[PDB]
Amino acid sequence: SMSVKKPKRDDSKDLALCSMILTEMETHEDAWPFLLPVNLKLVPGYKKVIKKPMDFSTIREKLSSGQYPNLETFALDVRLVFDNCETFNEDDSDIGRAGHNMRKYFEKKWTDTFK
Residue ranges of the Bromo domain? Predict the structure, then answer.
């Protein structure tokens, strides 16, 4: 509250560390569905169904231009990529499996880096 603060957690390396994680996600062999924005002209249903599209290139550009206020807003966008993928893709499809695998990969790196 006013004039009452928990001790200052060191957040000075968060930007660098989120960039490292994102690099690891970009280079994963199962990243291919997620590297670029889904082409809304060429994929029926996507525009209407997925209210907030997100992809790794969009996250990288937001990261690089100071559009994440803190590491939680970064994790929210990463999780949105995988939540969108589960909304649109069957679990037993190459893309559906890719998104489960990547979500797992991310959540471990997130815990190991920050928790």
Answer: 9-113
CATH number, domain with residue 69: 1.20.920.10
E runs forming strands in the chain: none
Number of domains in the chain: 1
DSSP secondary structure code for residue 42 in this structure: T
Range of the domain at 107: 1-115
Decide: 34 and 56 in contact? Cβ < 8 Å. yes
Query: What tokens does 24 get?
Result: 């690891």
Break the chain down into helix, strand, coil percent, rounded to 5: 65, 0, 35
The amino acid occupying position 50 is I
Structure tokens at 11: 């957040």
Q: What's the distance, CA 90 to chain centroid?
A: 20
Q: Tell me how far apart the alpha carbons of residues 56 and 70 are, in angstroms, rounded to a whole number.
A: 17
Q: Resolution limit in angstroms?
A: 1.7
Please answer whether residues 102 and 28 qualify as being in contact, where contact means their C-beta atoms are separated by less than 8 angstroms. yes
Tell me how the structure was determined.
X-ray
